[PDB]
Amino acid sequence: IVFFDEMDSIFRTRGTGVSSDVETTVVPQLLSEIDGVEGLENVIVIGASNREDMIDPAILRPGRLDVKIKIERPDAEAAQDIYSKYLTEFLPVHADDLAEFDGDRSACIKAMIEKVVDRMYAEIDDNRFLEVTYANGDKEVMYFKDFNSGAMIQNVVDRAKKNAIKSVLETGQPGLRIQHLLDSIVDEFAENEDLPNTTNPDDWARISGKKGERIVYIRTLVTLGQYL
Amino acid sequence: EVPDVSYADIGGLSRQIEQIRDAVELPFLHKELYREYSLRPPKGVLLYGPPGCGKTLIAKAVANSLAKKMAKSYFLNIKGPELLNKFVGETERHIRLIFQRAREKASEGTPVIVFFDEMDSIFRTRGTGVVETTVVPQLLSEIDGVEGLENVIVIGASNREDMIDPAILRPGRLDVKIKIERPDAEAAQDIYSKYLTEFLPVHADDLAEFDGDRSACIKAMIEKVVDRMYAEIDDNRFLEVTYANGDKEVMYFKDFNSGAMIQNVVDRAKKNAIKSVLETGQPGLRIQHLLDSIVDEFAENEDLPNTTNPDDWARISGKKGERIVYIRTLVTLGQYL
Amino acid sequence: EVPDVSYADIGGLSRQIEQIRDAVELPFLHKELYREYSLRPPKGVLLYGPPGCGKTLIAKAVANSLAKKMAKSYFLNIKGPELLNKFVGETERHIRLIFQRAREKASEGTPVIVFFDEMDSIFTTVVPQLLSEIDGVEGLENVIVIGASNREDMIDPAILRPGRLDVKIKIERPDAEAAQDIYSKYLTEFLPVHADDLAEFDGDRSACIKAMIEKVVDRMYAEIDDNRFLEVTYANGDKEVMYFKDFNSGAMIQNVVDRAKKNAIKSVLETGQPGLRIQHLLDSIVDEFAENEDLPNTTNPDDWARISGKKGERIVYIRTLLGQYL
Amino acid sequence: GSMAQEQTKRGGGGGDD
Amino acid sequence: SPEQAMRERSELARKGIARAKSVVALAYAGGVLFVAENPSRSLQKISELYDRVGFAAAGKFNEFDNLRRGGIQFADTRGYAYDRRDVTGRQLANVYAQTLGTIFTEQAKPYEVELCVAEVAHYGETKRPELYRITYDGSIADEPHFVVMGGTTEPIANALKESYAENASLTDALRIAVAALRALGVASLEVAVLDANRPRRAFRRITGSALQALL
Amino acid sequence: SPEQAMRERSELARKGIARAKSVVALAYAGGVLFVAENPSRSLQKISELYDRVGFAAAGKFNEFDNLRRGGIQFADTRGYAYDRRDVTGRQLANVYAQTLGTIFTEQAKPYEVELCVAEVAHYGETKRPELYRITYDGSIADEPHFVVMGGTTEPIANALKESYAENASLTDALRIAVAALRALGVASLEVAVLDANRPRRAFRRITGSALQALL
Ligand SMILES: Nc1ncnc2c1ncn2[C@@H]1O[C@H](COP(=O)(O)OP(=O)(O)OP(=O)(O)O)[C@@H](O)[C@H]1O
Ligand SMILES: Nc1ncnc2c1ncn2[C@@H]1O[C@H](COP(=O)(O)OP(=O)(O)O)[C@@H](O)[C@H]1O
Ligand SMILES: [Mg+2]
Q1: Where does the record place the region Docks into pockets in the proteasome alpha-ring (chain B)?
Q2: Of D4, D6, D11, which is closest to B88 when you measure between CB atoms?
Q3: What is the rounded distance in angstroms from the CA atom of residue C166 to the CA atom of residue C87?
Q4: Phi, then psi, of E210 in degrees rounded to 5
Q5: How many A from CA of C275 to the centre of ligand 2?
Q6: What are phi and psi of F31, to 5 degrees?
Q7: Is B335 in a helix, a strand, or coil?
Q8: Would an 8 Å CB–CB cutoff place D10 in contact with chain A?
Q9: Largest alpha-carbon pair distance within chain B?
Q10: Could you tell me if E148 and E115 are in contact, meaning their C-beta atoms sit under 8 angstroms apart?
Q11: How far is F125 from E27, CA to CA, in rounded Å?
Q12: Cα B273 to Cα B290: distance, rounded to the nearest angstrom
């Protein structure tokens, strides 16, 4: 297995080289060697990149990169599955959370996992992340769910753990609470909402293809007489 | 040297095979006949078209057919970036040595074919660079010098013919151009037949419908899958092209079909068959496997605009006449009586 | 290039040959007359005529004739679309480099013809640079600037102003007589001929070749069902049919000759009897017209002008062969 | 109508003494 | 380009007619037979227009019922203004053509409808049944044997092409029409006739148990 | 831009007149002869306008029939307001020209129609037949011998130019007109005359077996 990571720097589309670097001499060598004058087995090249548009069409030609795999944004069930990986029974849990479940840690863990996703994917006023104006002028209110990721889940879990450590250091009560997770998720959303350009253009292209209208504006939802 | 390839493996390309026979095989088979009519043999043949349409396949097929047709022929394959050395020397020495060896083999009497693959890497152009700028002059001089030899033939292939400078493509050196178009329904059927052989295991359910007639079952399956792939179903919509004067264009998958995609469809169907025999224990292949392979291939290639090529866009704009403004990737009232 | 194209090489262009002679060779015999008169001979010849045909061949012929007169010859051919370096003034630099090479060649006592082709693609722009370079090279009267363009209307009249490119020459299609000339130039007497066709002319090879050329030219220049190449629609909607006589070109005729030779070789290697037959010529004509249906006619772009300029009127729709209307 | 910046590619060179 | 935009308008109307059910009308010995695939019991796609003139339609119900009503209005105003025997299927067809053309060019959305106007001779009279098909743009076509409207018309039109027989009785023409339509019970069929033998009002529905016996 | 709208309107109307069947009208001994290529039996492209004034058209049926109706309206209102012998082919032609000058510049889509108004003398009177041709722009042309409308006019016009003969009988003019039109049986021809010999109403259709005998 030869793994090419970030196939955007090389494997670029021939031509369109505004920068003086010459990709028209290196990528034909890759095309000739991968295909081969004589077919060669037992060697598989795997390429991972988040910019599939910049890749040259000849490389993505079937029979040369025949297997193509798209990893998409997680949904609610995928969010629960990802949370189950990080929120483990081995993680210390506060006595109050364990109290109502009578010492059954698995039930408490899965209940907290469900509770976190119940608000993370919820569509309320506080979760309105972005608003987009289409060519028709119609506007859609995109929430943080559309831009959710497994890395975001890991960051939320890490922030909750850090808050639990701070609480243990200051108050002295060991354990992790659900309110720690709520604070972590709201703080993470607040941190990530200041940046409007945080996704690749492929998401915008997919949205335009779904709506059918051209995207022209993006806005952040941060926030005369005779009156009696 | 690549053996085990012939025109019989390539299907759906009839005219182009005849042309490549005329340009290459005929001068070697008949020399006095050419001299009688004072017709100079074509020295250079270039192959262009959409990617994966079979330029290298035709190249190796003609290389083998030249050896098999005569009643000792030498085929030379060299790539662009292969003849590039970081030192100031050997950048041109290697090419001159290669052509001298080609002339030596021609003097020995054995016909020699030089195959310049991916001519976009080298010989493309010198004006747009944004020494590589000193490759095409001496190459053109050497080709002009070797033109007099009867048995020397130069073959080139390239996905993008626009990047190649017309100086090498002027009448003379590269006098023959061959375009390999995307397959159509009959070509698709031929390509499917080139792979869906009777030697592949077939499930008892499909085979019983033809009373053990393997050929009839296979050809019926090929026709069925070809009809399924080229049908204008709503599931087959691929692209939406926008023209400001025009209403719009609709592009289906059939506009970007190629033989490599057919081969991958067959491979995916066979993989599904293997998984089926592993999960249920029933050996053979089914039509459902082919249909699932087709739909999976379409879904897999739905997101990527990779199938589109500058040649395809040039054809579309020379068909509609209006420059494209936007390309969209399609993906999934009342009281009607 | 080798000055191998003589006057006999080009046919049907005798008046063009004489016009070129008047434009080029006349001042050489009267250079002392211009010097006494303090004059400037015109060194600008704009050859505007049919599309892909033999328009450039006339430039190869005047070069050969000029080589003959001083009895070593250079012909700098530049294509127009490939000269374009759109990005940022690279094309202006390329034009300066071409003219510097022309000046260097003019330093040597060998006549040099600087020819530009497909100049209708181009023309605040590169035009002032071209005019400045032409004015600079005007001092070198030995160097002759020859431009070709199939669309005289699109050419900017600035280059057509009096002075540099004063001499404009029109070119035409191959006429039946010119077709017989061009066919004779490739179909020479040395080509093998069929014995059965010789029986019709008692073994006179030259007469047989002439009769065969006349026959093939007549058939190709005939209004028959075999000449349905183009169908023309109009705003008035008078759908008419163009024939193989129209859009005829020498380069296409050479291709027809090449295909006929290939077909004759195939017939010799298959049937066994050597010789040439009219069937070979007809098959070559059909195949070459089938091939030529592609290059000029994608029929949506640029074909409207390519047919309207030659015919003389704009054509709404071209083809290749609501409701409640009553 | 755009400007470009060049990146050089060094060529091998070796001398003795 | 208005012309390219018109191609979109034609496609939208064609899409609406396909997004629906199929109707057939064919000539038989006693007149003309309408057989439509209709699940509802209240909403109908076949209607009397005048004494000897019937009407079938396929598309968007509110619109072809709008046309149904307009045609009824027209026919009765003429019949009263002149006489009953002066209103002919030909006039009606022509009015529908003018109206669908005006709608197709002037209104925002074109009527996604397809119409068939049928006429038979008067009582004790002899004359061949006339079928006209009016399309969404205003085009009108004179049919000698049968009209098929809405949905996928090719298979039904071909099956009828093989099975059709002039002077077929009512039962045979019903079998042919249901068979070609399948290419359905009394609970999913709307069947009516323009019986040329009736003295005045020729239109007559065939429903329930009588329809059950006929098929 | 007035120029671009004028050249766009002009090339669409013309892409409709040449997108239709062909009609000819020519003078012969007994008056004027209209011969049109018409497959339908109900839809007609030749019509009486007034006692001695006939009308032929080529284009979009709903529109030239709209003009047919408007002209009938006009002629009858004049004839009643003043007298029958006061309505002339010249007035009618002029009204059609004004109408096709107003429609072309004011309506959304120009009428894609080509009109020919014909007139003969009254009974027992002597005068040459008059043919006028009104184009979709609103121009009117005075024709001495024949008018050709719709489809490929130039090949048909060339044949009539060779075959035309003044004072040809009805049968000869019919042969000439059908011949030049071919450049078709009684089931694909619409033939009518403006017979100058009739006492009042000059227009008269020639159909069926009588047409069969004439051709
Ligand atoms: N009739 C056919 N024409 C073209 N390709 C075919 C045909 N039948 C099968 N193929 C498959 O198409 C694949 C691509 O062939 P080939 O390598 O010649 O394309 P290519 O010209 O090299 O493409 P590129 O130039 O983009 O690399 C082959 O693996 C072959 O199995
Ligand atoms: N009058 C002619 N006599 C001989 N060959 C001619 C003549 N006219 C055209 N040709 C042929 O046309 C080709 C030359 O084309 P050229 O003038 O160089 O370019 P272009 O096709 O762009 O005008 C050759 O095949 C040549 O033999
Ligand atoms: Mg290849």
Answers
A1: 336-337
A2: D11
A3: 32
A4: -60, -50
A5: 26
A6: 145, -120
A7: coil
A8: no
A9: 83
A10: no
A11: 52
A12: 9
Q: How was this structure determined?
A: cryo-EM
Q: Cα–Cα distance between B191 and B222 in angstroms, integer?
A: 10
Q: What are phi and psi of B115, to 5 degrees?
A: -110, 110
Name the CA radius of gyration of chain D, rounded. Answer: 15
Q: With contact defined as beta carbons under 8 Å apart, do B47 and B156 qualify?
A: yes
What is the four-CA torsion angle of C215, C221, C224, C230, rounded to 10 degrees? 140
Contact C326, F21 (CB under 8 A): yes
Distance CA A10, CA A51 (A): 12
Give the domain ranges of chain F.
1-215
Q: Which residue CA neighbors atom 26 of ligand 1 most closely?
A: B51
- Report the alpha-carbon distance of residue B302 to residue B238 in Å, rounded: 6
Residue nearest atom 4 of ligand 1, based on CA coordinates: B54
Q: In sequence order, which residues have a C-beta less than 8 Å from that of residue A188 and are 6 or more positions away?
A: A152, A155, A156, A159
Give the chain B residue nearest D2 (alpha carbons): B130
Domain E1-215's class?
alpha beta
Determine the 3-state secondary structure of B20 from DSSP.
Answer: helix
Tokens of A136: 């028709």
Q: Identify the helix (H) or strand (E) that includes residue E26.
A: strand E23-28
Q: C-alpha dihedral over C214, C216, C221, C222, to 10 degrees?
A: 100
d(CA E107, CA E99): 11
Residue with tokens 């029109």: C170
Backbone φ and ψ of F44, nearest 5°: -125, 145
Q: How far is CA E78 from CA B246, E50, E82, E200, in A?
A: 45, 10, 6, 17
CA distance F96 to F137: 11
Spatial contact of E195 and E31, defined as CB atoms under 8 Å apart = yes
Q: DSSP letter for B330, please.
A: -
- Any binding-site annotation on C26? no
Q: How many helices (H) and strands (E) does chain A have?
A: 7, 5
| F154 and C238 Cβ atoms separated by less than 8 Å | yes
Secondary structure class of E132 (helix, strand, coil): strand
Q: Which residues of A touch B308 (CB under 8 A)?
A: 57
SS3 state of residue B33: helix
Look up residue E203 and give its amino acid.
Answer: F
Residue the block writes with tokens 């892409």: F15
Name A215's bridge partners: A134
How many CB atoms are closer than 10 A to CB C181? 20
Give the integer Cα–Cα distance in Å for A26 and A10.
Answer: 8
Name the residue type at position C129.
Q
Among D residues 1-17, those touching chain C with beta carbons less than 8 Å apart: 1-4
Q: How many residues does chain C have?
A: 326
Give the Å distance between the CA of B257 and the centre of ligand 3.
Answer: 17
Whether D6 contacts chain A with CB within 8 A: yes
What is d(CA F182, CA F178) in angstroms, rounded to the nearest whole number?
A: 6
**Resolution, Å (one decimal):** 3.8
Quickly list H helices, C190-272: 195-199, 205-220, 250-270
DSSP 8-state secondary structure symbol assigned to residue C305: H
Cβ partners under 8 Å of residue E4, min gap 6: B243, B245, B246, B247
The answer to whether residues B142 and B95 touch, using CB atoms and an 8 Å cutoff, is yes
The span from the CA of F71 to the CA of E40, in Å, is 47
C157 exposed, middle or buried (CB, 10 Å; 0-12, 13-18, 19+)? exposed
Integer Cα distance of C324 and C314 in angstroms: 29
Is the CB of C111 inside a 6 Å radius of any atom of ligand 2?
A: no
- Residue B40, CA distances (Å) to B19, B30, B204, C258, C262 in order: 16, 12, 58, 9, 11
Q: Which residues 229-288 of C have a C-beta within 8 angstroms of B?
A: 258, 261-262, 264-265, 268-269, 274
Torsion of CA B34, B37, B43, B45, to 10 degrees: -90
DSSP state of C190: T
User: Could you say which DSSP state residue A13 is in?
Assistant: P
